[PDB]
Amino acid sequence: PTHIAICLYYKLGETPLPLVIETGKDAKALQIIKLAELYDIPVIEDIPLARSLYKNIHKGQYITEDFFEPVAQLIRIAIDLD
Amino acid sequence: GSHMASMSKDEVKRRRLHSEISGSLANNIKKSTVIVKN
């Protein structure tokens, strides 16, 4: 699609792995990003990673081993910023 | 989505819904860690 947004959630004691809690394309993707900005959630553009997550990891599913390294990197950025 | 927890809680309220309520876009984004976009 034109726009993709993947919302990732990782919280010690709640999630054993990062969880795709929301996903969206097009209007729904733009929505996610606007709400992210409102709630001061970091937003990072990574086109290959966004595309691969969208295709492979569905809403409510934990990420799989192929995504551990790239997603963990972003989670670490978020922890740093928080 | 079109259903928010407050609609359920408001339906009940004295009395109050004790059990927790799913799953709104807003609730999910608010607690989220990072958004990855294309």
Q: Does A30 touch chain B (CB under 8 A)?
A: no
Element (H, E) at B36: strand B34-37
The length of chain B, given as a count of residues:
38
Helix axes A68-81, A47-56, angle to 10 degrees: 120
State whether residue B35 is helix, strand or coil: strand
Write the residue in B28, B29, B37 that is nearest to A50 by C-beta.
B37
Interchain CB distance below 8 Å, B35 and A46: no
Interchain CB distance below 8 Å, B34 and A43: yes
Of B38, B9, B20, the closest CA to residue A25 belongs to B38
Range of the domain at A11: 1-82
Structural domains in chain A (count):
1
Question: Could you give the C-alpha distances from A13 to A17, A18, B25, in angstroms and in order?
Answer: 10, 12, 22
In sequence order, which residues have a C-beta less than 8 Å from that of residue B31 and are 6 or more positions away?
Answer: A9, A11, A21
CATH number at residue A43: 3.40.1690.10
